[PDB]
Every structure is written in structure tokens, then in C-alpha cells.
Amino acid sequence: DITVYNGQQKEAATAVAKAFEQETGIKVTLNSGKSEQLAGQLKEEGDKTPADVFYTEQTATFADLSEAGLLAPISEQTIQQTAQKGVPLAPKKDWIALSGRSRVVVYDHTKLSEKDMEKSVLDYATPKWKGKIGYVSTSGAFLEQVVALSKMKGDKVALNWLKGLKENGKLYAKNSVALQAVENGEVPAALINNYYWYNLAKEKGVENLKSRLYFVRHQDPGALVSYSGAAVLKASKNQAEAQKFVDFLASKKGQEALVAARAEYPLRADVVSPFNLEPYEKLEAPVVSATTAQDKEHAIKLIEEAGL
Ligand SMILES: O=C(O)CN(CCN(CC(=O)O)CC(=O)O)CC(=O)O
Ligand SMILES: [Fe+3]
């Protein structure tokens, strides 16, 4: 049996842990928390950690741990199972990306069509979209988007985008609220993440929704994907089962379990999501370095400078 420090949404983690317990008979104990906190705890615990695996919604949180020498290598063969072009790879082969969440534009298809959409996320923050674009400045993925803009286009472009949203956008407290605002006709489009919409569509039926999704693609900053993943702790005294679990997560079966539980894009190329997601490769996500604490601090400063 293994102990998994879990920064991923509890529902997803519970699902893969059960499919694992069923393929193998090995019990998983999930210890859930925020990935940044869990990473801090793993670093502090060091060679005395009881964690076998760290399962996260954000592979960026592995960087501090890898840099501290706290992660074990994963089999090359396992890493390759999800190594689609675009997918972040651990330079030390000491963690693996497993699935992704995407930025997206949700829009009310009774008011806008795909031909009205902007091909760059930068262009939603402009006067064409005055009063017409929702955004969620407190959201984690919004912050990731700002970080990506700063990295890809520079801080001035990122700040200008934020000021453009301040002037032209409608602020919503949460992605779910923004999605409902589009559905209810309050705003014709909003910047959210994919999984809110796919969840709503799965539950209610797309035939009963006014909203649709527009993906900018072509490695635009707005095609940003945030990657979930897993790592084995170097200090684990149960390497064999820890590795078995990570191997399972990258297996067809483990990926099938994840995608049934949460509308993340699987990174295997032979798994289709019951949420009816497009294949990961079609997203054309940009390649962006991992978000650091420093990156986040800088992005928060830009949000404040923009008046948000
Ligand atoms: O709790 C929230 O406010 C939204 N989140 C978690 C935050 N997000 C990113 C975002 O909504 O911007 C998912 C994640 O970071 O893993 C719950 C969910 O996505 O199910
Ligand atoms: Fe979310």
C-alpha cells in the first residue's frame, strides 16, 4: 500500500486511486492539500517523508522538489506514454505529465459565432469587446495566463492586456459564475477553462446549452494548457509500488479512469474522454516554462498595477 500526497481535485484523485486498487490490489491513501503546500511539506520532510507519490494538478510544483533532489526517476518507457509533442518533460526524468486543462473562450452561440471570435487572446481585451468579455481575475488559471503572456510577449503586453480587461471586460468572481453569465445572456463571452463547460455539457446535454467553446489554438498564449502529473519521492521505501502507481497513471487504464472523473485532456493518444474533449494535439498549446513562485508574484503585481 502507498501514501499519495494529492494536490489534484479530490474527485479525480479518488477515481484513479480506485482503478489502481482494482488493477493491482494495492491500497492508496490520499493525503490531500494544496500542491504548493504539499511540495513545501515534502521538502521539509525530506528523507523522512511518508509520501510515496506526489500527485498534482500542476507539474510546475515539481520543480522545487526536483531541484532539491527529492524525486526518483520514472521509467523512460512510462514517460513516453504521455510524451506527445508539446507536453512538458522533466529534464531529470523525475516526474511525468499526465493530463491537462486548457484556457478557453466560452461564448453564447445565439449572439456570437466562431467568425466573431478573436484568434489571439490579446484581442479580447480591446474596445471591440467592451462590455462583451467576462474574466475572472482571482482565478488560478487566469494568473497562469498572465504569467504566460509575460513570458511569451513581455510584461508590457501582459499589463496592457490586463488594463484592457479592466476597461472592456466584465469581472466575475469565479469561472463557474462567468460560465453561467454567458449561459444566462449577461455577457456574450468569457475567458474560462475548458472543464467547466464540458462538465456542464455532460450533465445538462450540449443540446440544452446556449454556450459553446472557442479555442484559439496555434500556440497563442490563450491556448495555454496547465498540466497535471505525478512523481515518486526519492525517499520512499516502497519504490516498487510507488512506481507501479505512476506507471498505472500513464497506462491506458489509468488515463481512462482519470478522464471519466474529470474533464482534463488525457496525454495518452489512445484514450478518448467521455466528456467529448478534442485530442490534446488539436489544442496547439504553447510551450511555456513552468510557473514559479516568483512568476506568480510578478503576475500579481501586474494585476494590481492594472487596477484589478
Ligand atoms: O476552486 C476554484 O475556485 C476553481 N477550482 C480550482 C482552480 N482551477 C483553476 C481555475 O479555476 O482557474 C483548477 C486548478 O487549478 O487545478 C476548482 C476546479 O477547477 O474544479
Ligand atoms: Fe478551476
Curated annotation (Swiss-Prot):
<dbReference type="GO" id="GO:0046872">
    <property type="term" value="F:metal ion binding"/>
</dbReference>
<feature type="binding site">
    <location>
        <position position="9"/>
    </location>
    <ligand>
        <name>Fe cation</name>
    </ligand>
</feature>
<feature type="binding site">
    <location>
        <position position="57"/>
    </location>
    <ligand>
        <name>Fe cation</name>
    </ligand>
</feature>
<comment type="similarity">
    <text>Belongs to the bacterial solute-binding protein 1 family.</text>
</comment>
<keyword id="KW-0813">Transport</keyword>
<keyword id="KW-0732">Signal</keyword>
<dbReference type="GO" id="GO:0006826">
    <property type="term" value="P:iron ion transport"/>
</dbReference>
<feature type="binding site">
    <location>
        <position position="196"/>
    </location>
    <ligand>
        <name>Fe cation</name>
    </ligand>
</feature>
<dbReference type="InterPro" id="IPR006059">
    <property type="entry name" value="SBP"/>
</dbReference>
<keyword id="KW-0479">Metal-binding</keyword>
<keyword id="KW-0408">Iron</keyword>
<comment type="subunit">
    <text>The complex is composed of two ATP-binding proteins (FbpC), two transmembrane proteins (FbpB) and a solute-binding protein (FbpA).</text>
</comment>
<keyword id="KW-0574">Periplasm</keyword>
<dbReference type="InterPro" id="IPR026045">
    <property type="entry name" value="Ferric-bd"/>
</dbReference>
<dbReference type="Pfam" id="PF01547">
    <property type="entry name" value="SBP_bac_1"/>
</dbReference>
<comment type="function">
    <text>Part of the ABC transporter complex FbpABC (TC 3.A.1.10.1) involved in Fe(3+) ions import. This protein specifically binds Fe(3+) and is involved in its transmembrane transport.</text>
</comment>
<keyword id="KW-0410">Iron transport</keyword>
<protein>
    <recommendedName>
        <fullName>Iron-utilization periplasmic protein</fullName>
    </recommendedName>
</protein>
<keyword id="KW-0406">Ion transport</keyword>
<feature type="binding site">
    <location>
        <position position="195"/>
    </location>
    <ligand>
        <name>Fe cation</name>
    </ligand>
</feature>
<dbReference type="InterPro" id="IPR006061">
    <property type="entry name" value="SBP_1_CS"/>
</dbReference>
<dbReference type="GO" id="GO:0055085">
    <property type="term" value="P:transmembrane transport"/>
</dbReference>
<dbReference type="GO" id="GO:0042597">
    <property type="term" value="C:periplasmic space"/>
</dbReference>
